[PDB]
Enzyme design. Structure first.
Site, short mmCIF file in Angstrom:
data_model
loop_
_atom_site.label_atom_id
_atom_site.label_comp_id
_atom_site.label_asym_id
_atom_site.label_seq_id
_atom_site.Cartn_x
_atom_site.Cartn_y
_atom_site.Cartn_z
N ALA B 53 0.57 -1.40 -0.09
CA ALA B 53 0.00 -0.48 -0.47
C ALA B 53 1.23 1.24 0.04
CB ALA B 53 -0.83 0.23 1.21
N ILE B 54 1.36 1.66 -1.54
CA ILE B 54 1.85 2.49 -1.85
C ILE B 54 1.85 3.75 -1.82
CG2 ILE B 54 4.58 3.45 -2.74
CD1 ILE B 54 4.92 0.61 -0.93
N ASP B 141 -2.77 -8.06 -4.36
CA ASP B 141 -3.16 -6.74 -4.41
C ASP B 141 -4.08 -6.13 -3.38
OD1 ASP B 141 -1.66 -7.11 -6.94
OD2 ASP B 141 -3.91 -5.70 -7.92
N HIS B 163 -6.26 -16.00 -14.32
CA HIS B 163 -7.14 -14.77 -14.79
C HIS B 163 -7.97 -14.71 -15.40
CE1 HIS B 163 -6.99 -10.73 -16.18
NE2 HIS B 163 -5.94 -10.28 -16.18
N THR B 175 -1.80 -13.39 -22.85
CA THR B 175 -1.34 -12.31 -23.24
C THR B 175 0.23 -11.93 -22.48
OG1 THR B 175 -1.94 -10.64 -21.20
CG2 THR B 175 -3.17 -10.13 -23.47
N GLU B 233 3.45 -9.96 -13.50
CA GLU B 233 2.42 -10.68 -14.39
C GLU B 233 3.08 -12.03 -15.55
OE1 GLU B 233 -1.38 -9.87 -16.45
OE2 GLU B 233 -1.88 -10.62 -13.97
N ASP B 256 -13.95 -9.55 -11.47
CA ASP B 256 -15.00 -7.78 -11.33
C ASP B 256 -15.90 -8.25 -11.61
OD1 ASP B 256 -14.98 -5.65 -11.88
OD2 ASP B 256 -13.35 -5.27 -12.29
O1 LIG Z 1 1.34 4.03 -6.70
C1 LIG Z 1 1.15 2.68 -6.88
C2 LIG Z 1 0.73 1.43 -7.94
C3 LIG Z 1 0.09 0.42 -7.15
N1 LIG Z 1 0.25 -0.61 -5.95
C4 LIG Z 1 0.55 -1.84 -5.54
O2 LIG Z 1 0.67 -2.75 -6.77
C5 LIG Z 1 -0.94 -3.45 -6.75
C6 LIG Z 1 -0.98 -3.53 -8.32
O3 LIG Z 1 -1.01 -2.77 -9.19
P1 LIG Z 1 -2.59 -2.16 -9.75
O4 LIG Z 1 -3.65 -2.58 -8.17
O5 LIG Z 1 -2.35 -1.15 -9.81
O6 LIG Z 1 -2.26 -2.74 -10.89
P2 LIG Z 1 -4.10 -3.81 -11.68
O7 LIG Z 1 -4.49 -4.14 -10.64
O8 LIG Z 1 -4.80 -2.36 -11.82
O9 LIG Z 1 -3.23 -4.11 -12.93
C7 LIG Z 1 -1.15 -2.84 -5.90
O10 LIG Z 1 -2.74 -3.76 -5.61
C8 LIG Z 1 -0.81 -2.42 -4.97
O11 LIG Z 1 -0.48 -3.47 -3.52
C9 LIG Z 1 1.26 0.19 -4.71
O12 LIG Z 1 0.68 0.40 -3.34
N2 LIG Z 1 0.62 1.86 -4.62
O1 LIG Z 2 -3.88 -9.51 -19.73
C1 LIG Z 2 -2.94 -8.69 -18.65
C2 LIG Z 2 -3.98 -7.14 -18.57
O2 LIG Z 2 -5.48 -7.85 -18.26
C3 LIG Z 2 -6.21 -6.94 -17.62
O3 LIG Z 2 -7.79 -6.96 -18.49
C4 LIG Z 2 -5.70 -6.39 -16.73
O4 LIG Z 2 -6.91 -5.70 -16.10
C5 LIG Z 2 -3.97 -6.51 -16.62
O5 LIG Z 2 -4.04 -6.25 -15.67
C6 LIG Z 2 -3.59 -7.68 -17.06
O6 LIG Z 2 -3.92 -8.70 -16.43
MN LIG Z 3 -5.13 -4.38 -8.75
#
Ligand SMILES: O=c1ccn([C@@H]2O[C@H](COP(=O)(O)OP(=O)(O)O)[C@@H](O)[C@H]2O)c(=O)[nH]1
Ligand SMILES: OC[C@H]1O[C@@H](O)[C@H](O)[C@@H](O)[C@H]1O
Ligand SMILES: [Mn+2]
Ligand SMILES: O=c1ccn([C@@H]2O[C@H](COP(=O)(O)OP(=O)(O)O)[C@@H](O)[C@H]2O)c(=O)[nH]1
Ligand SMILES: OC[C@H]1O[C@@H](O)[C@H](O)[C@@H](O)[C@H]1O
Ligand SMILES: [Mn+2]
Lengths: 277, 277
Positions: B53-54, B141, B163, B175, B233, B256
């Protein structure tokens, strides 16, 4: 390269392929042997197979061993341990590469109950020796032949095998030990499966635990002037109730075609009983 | 007492419940939580949950933590590790018995790529400390909430999570990283599943291996002036291709509802994304 597993089109839809404690139930079509062979090859895994051939049962060795060479862990290192009261009677069978056989000489008991029951003692005590020579121990009946692939898909810390006469049955009918004065006692509303005595195994450590516990439990019973209904198989079912196997083999792995046929649900008959008098 | 597992009437017939390397795929109806709770209680198992949690993401902590107290490993010992550049911002949340929280303070990176990517470094290095305090590490996350049971059914030496946008898809569409100059390179005709970066774990030992390897692989790429398409990932999918997880969580475990609904095949939505700008 291999077919892509498809999350929404299950390979097998006719059978239960996992237990409620998340152990795989091993059936054709649930595994890709190439993937599994890769994983086991990378640890240079050795499999030990113990088999008892006491008295006339030395007659079963030749076919057992020949079919084990065609179907058992082919391509992996195997160490056969033959336990017998007649070392000279053990047929010479040609082994594939990385495969060996040792003959361990033992006493006979007049009663067949004790021969089958004392397997647990005897496997248990080759104890320091299994730990160094092999990673897994598989313990089977000698009166049997391999008719298809039995490989690394079965390997796990602890496994049992569904008795073929009881897989489609309810627990009330399972021929568990039902007398609370026996250490093998299982109550009427407990039990996951009925496991057969003729094919179990696991890591060396887990198999030494099982066999120690079954022996210690058979002895306790004797000193109480009682013998378990189905003997070692009774104690096995009790151990496996309390210590749930990490894989369960389907009846593909222990069958009798004469007595039960070849049902559609069994796509391979891997290891089967041999007729005896 | 519990319902008897029935070998010829599979609980789930609509989904794949085991991978071709015999790892369970975890879905409602494949497990009896009471059995599993029993097994995990007997080892007095401790679960560590790491969460970053940054910056503004400290906003997500409160709900994350409150819902973790209602749904995550309830009845078992949990140690939350919150990694943050703002220790004072971590809400005080009341913990159930045998549950604790530690705040570990870290640097921020301007770029969001590196925050997400450096999780691997940072989890990897609290190394001697995880080994003594916990038996399993679960890495998620923070932008998420628990909406149903996430328990010991997920615990195994190594797991990933399908995923949710790709479970019904073919591998060509996944991907993955497709440029052979990246250490995350996966060719067009390889791949089992597409795993999401937001929920993985295993034993402490296996998670330290994964995170070490992903870090070592991200660094190598930088020194070659390339960043993986989907970052951590991408490297996760590569590690999990070569080191196959011993369980795979269904999309029940990473959903989601806004973007994808509640399909019939998902009987519970356990852990879900939170809206963000
Ligand atoms: O400014 C930030 C950006 C990301 N995160 C961490 O990195 C994780 C993954 O990034 P994010 O959730 O943005 O990616 P997404 O789920 O949207 O692809 C977040 O849940 C947090 O644990 C954080 O702590 N600060
Ligand atoms: O395809 C990879 C990407 O897929 C999106 O749907 C997801 O929001 C991203 O976080 C990443 O996982
Ligand atoms: Mn996330
Ligand atoms: O005189 C005997 C009786 C039994 N056995 C061993 O004990 C196992 C189990 O007994 P059996 O096969 O007779 O039991 P069943 O399969 O018929 O119930 C045999 O396969 C042999 O390994 C043996 O070696 N000598
Ligand atoms: O019910 C237990 C018994 O079942 C029989 O069918 C089998 O031949 C015996 O070996 C024993 O397992
Ligand atoms: Mn027999």
């Amino acid at each position: 390269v291999y077919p892509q597993p498809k999350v929404l089109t299950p390979c097998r839809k006719d059978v239960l392929v996992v237990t409620p404690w998340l152990a795989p139930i091993v059936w054709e079509g649930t595994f890709n042997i190439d993937i599994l062979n890769e994983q086991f090859r990378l640890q240079n895994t050795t499999i030990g197979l113990t088999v008892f051939a006491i008295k006339k049962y030395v007659a079963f060795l030749k076919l057992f061993l020949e079919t084990a060479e065609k179907h058992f862990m082919v391509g992996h290192r195997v160490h056969y341990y033959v336990f017998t009261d007649q070392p000279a009677a053990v047929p010479r069978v040609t082994l594939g590469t990385g495969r060996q056989l040792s003959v361990l000489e033992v006493g006979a008991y007049k009663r067949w109950q004790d021969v089958s029951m004392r397997r647990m003692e005897m496997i248990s005590a080759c104890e320091r020796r299994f730990l160094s020579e092999v990673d897994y121990l598989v313990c089977v009946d000698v009166d049997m032949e391999f008719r298809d692939h039995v490989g690394v898909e079965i390997l796990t810390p602890l496994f049992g095998t569904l008795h073929p006469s009881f897989y489609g049955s309810s627990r009330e009918a399972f021929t568990y030990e039902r007398r609370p004065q026996s250490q093998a006692y299982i109550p009427k509303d407990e039990g996951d499966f009925y496991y057969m005595g003729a094919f179990f195994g696991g890591s060396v450590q887990e198999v030494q635990r099982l066999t120690r516990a079954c022996h210690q439990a058979m002895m306790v019973d004797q000193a109480n002037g009682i013998e378990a209904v189905w003997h070692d198989e009774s104690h096995l079912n009790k151990y496996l109730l309390r210590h749930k196997p990490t894989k369960v083999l389907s009846p593909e792995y222990l069958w009798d075609q004469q007595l039960l046929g070849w049902p559609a649900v069994l796509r391979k008959l891997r290891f089967t009983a041999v007729p005896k008098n």
